[PDB]
C-alpha cells in the first residue's frame, strides 16, 4: 500500500496531543506515497505514533521557552518516508530540546550498567543506545519501539543533540 | 608520556612488512608529540602494531592490483594521535581494498550468529562489529580487549575499494 494509509491518521493525533500538552507544533509529512508491503503498513503505525508522541512531549519546547532560547517560536515535527534501494526509510525529526546525553550517562551509572571510567570514552551512538535497554527511561520506551521494528526485520537508529533536536530513523526490508 | 615513544618504532616495521609483502606504502605519522598516561603508551603499542600489520597485509593492495583498479600505485597508511577534550584519539587509516561487509554478513549467517532475514537492514557499525567476535576471522578481539582494559573504545569504518579507518579513544588519565 502507500504508507499514507498510516500517515493520514497522524495530523489528527498530533493536533490532539499538541492541544492536550498545550504545545504548538508545525507538523509536516513527506513521502506519503511511498509504497510498501501490507504487513508493514499494518504494524508500523503503533511505533510511529509512539515516536511522534515522544517528540511532542519530550522534544518540542513550549513556544515561550523556544523564544527565550532564540529558536523559531513554533517547533517543527517532520515525518517522512522514502525508498532506499529495496528498503524503505522512515524518519521522525523534531527541532526540540534534544536528548541530554549527560543525563543518560548518569542514569546508566546509577543503574550499574557502566562505570564513570568507561563513560568518558563512549561514542554518541554508544550513549544513545542506552535508550534501547528495556526499562532504561521508565512515557514511550525506545525498547518497545525497537521490539516492533525488529519483529519486521527492520533496524532503528537515533541521532540527537542538546538544543538542536532529534532524528529517529527506521529502515524496513522490502520483504 | 609522548606517544612518540611508541610511534617512533613503527616506520622501520611498516617498511619491512611492506617490502616483504611486495607493497609500496607511504607511511605518514601525525600527532606523535601527543602526551598521555605512560601506562597507555606502554600497552597501546602491541594493538597498534596489529592494526598497522592488518592494514598493510589485508588492506593495501600489491602495486599490480592497485594499477589494475586505477588507484595510485603507492598506498597510503596514516597513523595519527590527537587530543579531543580530555580524551586522546588514535586513528589508523589506509586507502586499501576496504572490508567486504557482504562477506562479513555471509560468515555471520554461516556461523549461526544471525539469520538471513535480519541482514537486509543491519547497520554498518553492527556489521563491522562482528570483526571483534573471537574466531570470526594478534586478533581484533584481543585489540578490543586491550582497549577496553584501558577504559577506551574502538570503532571501525570502511568502504569497499576505498579503504579502512580504525579509531581508538582513550582517556588521558
Ligand atoms: C527526548 N527529547 C527529545 C525527543 N525527540 C524525540 N524523542 C525525544 N526524547
Ligand atoms: C581488511 N581489509 C582492509 C583493512 N585495513 C585494515 N584492516 C583491514 N582488514
UniProtKB/Swiss-Prot annotation, chain B:
GO terms for biological process: chemotaxis. Residues 1-173 form the Histidine kinase domain. It is found in: Cytoplasm. The chain holds residues 356 to 540 of 671 of the full protein. It comes from the Bacteria. GO terms for cellular component: cytoplasm. One of its GO terms (molecular function) is phosphorelay sensor kinase activity. The keyword Nucleotide-binding applies. Coiled coil: none annotated. Keywords: ATP-binding, Chemotaxis, Cytoplasm, Kinase, Nucleotide-binding, Phosphoprotein, Transferase, Two-component regulatory system. This is Chemotaxis protein CheA. Involved in the transmission of sensory signals from the chemoreceptors to the flagellar motors. CheA is autophosphorylated; it can transfer its phosphate group to either CheB or CheY.
Amino acid at each position: 500500500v502507500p504508507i499514507s494509509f498510516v500517515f493520514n491518521r497522524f495530523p489528527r493525533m498530533v493536533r490532539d496531543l499538541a492541544k492536550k500538552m498545550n504545545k504548538e507544533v508545525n507538523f509536516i509529512m513527506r513521502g506519503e506515497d511511498t509504497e510498501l508491503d501490507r504487513t508493514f503498513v499494518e504494524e508500523i503505525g503503533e511505533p510511529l505514533l509512539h515516536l511522534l508522541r515522544n517528540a511532542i512531549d519530550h522534544g518540542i519546547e513550549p513556544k515561550e521557552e523556544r523564544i527565550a532560547k532564540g529558536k523559531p517560536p513554533i517547533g517543527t515535527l517532520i515525518l517522512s518516508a522514502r525508498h532506499e534501494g529495496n528498503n524503505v526509510v522512515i524518519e521522525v525529526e523534531d527541532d526540540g530540546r534534544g536528548i541530554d546525553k549527560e543525563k543518560i550517562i548518569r542514569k546508566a551509572i546509577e543503574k550499574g550498567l557502566i562505570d564513570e571510567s568507561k563513560a568518558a570514552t563512549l561514542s554518541d551512538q554508544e550513549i544513545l543506545n542506552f535508550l534501547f535497554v528495556p526499562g532504561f527511561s521508565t512515557g514511550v520506551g525506545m525498547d518497545v519501539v525497537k521490539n516492533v521494528v525488529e519483529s519486521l526485520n527492520g533496524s532503528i537508529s537515533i541521532e540527537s543533540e542538546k538544543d538542536k533536536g532529534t532524528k529517529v530513523t527506521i529502515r524496513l526490508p522490502l520483504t
